[PDB]
Write a protein that binds this ligand. Structure first.
Ligand SMILES: C[C@H](CCCC(C)(C)O)[C@H]1CC[C@@H]2C(/C=C/C3=C[C@@H](O)[C@@H](CCCO)[C@H](O)C3)=CCC[C@@]21C
Length: 255
């Protein structure tokens, strides 16, 4: 029987708002990047945990890039229909625990399968596995992060699907420390129902109806990458003088 309800006026308005919020908080020209502390790539190739931790040569650049992105995510979240109805305490819980996951999601826009890099664009602002190891991370995080980016690219999401998946990621009732889980779940359900309906309505063949389960599985993968990131950030934080190379926002959000 397979019903395909039309998008309601409200679901249409939710999608419009989320598209606008994303266009206002994601610059696809990367024009701010010249403001970051500059990328430095030392001869590593080894490629040597000792040398990498000794220098952390790409960390000031990539920490500035991630701090800037956290600011853009705070901005995007504040525009999600319902998010402002939450207590400021739940807003912050949700932002701090989703921040790294939304950055991984939104970075898929600059990611290219041409050479498996995040291309912002350019030459100086092209980031590879080797650049991420020069910021103190290891293959345990980087390799599955690359797998994740390829997996997501190949979903070929509509922009409507991409912005809804980010909103659903942020408003998750199962984050540690949330207080009004039912309200967050209500907001999420409204977003998830919008996404489900959108996919049925708008996505060819179909049924690549199955697309919705694939997107939910990405949200599960993101939780595992978040835990690996936390482990590695802890290690990074033990490197003497590391805090200089980070930013106050990054320090707070991650520890
Ligand atoms: C795991 C790591 C975060 C490391 C953070 C640290 C050092 C704090 O632990 C990686 C996650 C992705 C990140 C990355 C590129 C990210 C982005 C590029 C553009 O698409 C961005 C700007 C768009 C304009 O708003 C988007 O926000 C994110 C490349 C190389 C690996 C990472 C540095």
């Amino acid at each position: 029987d397979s019903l395909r309800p039309k998008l309601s006026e409200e679901q249409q308005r939710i999608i419009a708002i989320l598209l606008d919020a994303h266009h206002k908080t994601y610059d696809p020209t990367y024009s701010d990047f010249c403001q970051f502390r500059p990328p430095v790539r030392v001869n590593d190739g080894g490629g040597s945990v000792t040398l990498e931790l000794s220098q952390l040569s790409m960390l000031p650049h990539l920490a500035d890039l991630v701090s800037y992105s956290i600011q853009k995510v705070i901005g995007f979240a504040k525009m999600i229909p319902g998010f402002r109805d939450l207590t400021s305490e739940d807003q912050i819980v949700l932002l701090k625990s989703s921040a790294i996951e939304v950055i991984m999601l939104r970075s898929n826009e600059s990611f290219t399968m041409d050479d498996m890099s995040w291309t912002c664009g350019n030459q100086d602002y092209k980031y590879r596995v080797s650049d991420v190891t020069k910021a103190g991370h290891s293959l345990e995080l980087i390799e599955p992060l690359i797998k994740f980016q390829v997996g997501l690219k190949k979903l070929n999401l509509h922009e409507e699907e991409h912005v809804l998946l980010m909103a659903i990621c942020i408003v998750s009732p199962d984050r540690p420390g949330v207080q009004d889980a039912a309200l967050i779940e209500a907001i999420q359900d409204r977003l998830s129902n919008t996404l489900q309906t959108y996919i049925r309505c708008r996505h060819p063949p179909p049924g690549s109806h199955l697309l919705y389960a694939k997107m939910i599985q990405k949200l599960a993968d993101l939780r595992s990458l978040n835990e690996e990131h936390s482990k590695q950030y802890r290690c990074l934080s033990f490197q003497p003088e590391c805090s200089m190379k980070l930013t106050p926002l990054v320090l707070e959000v991650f520890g």
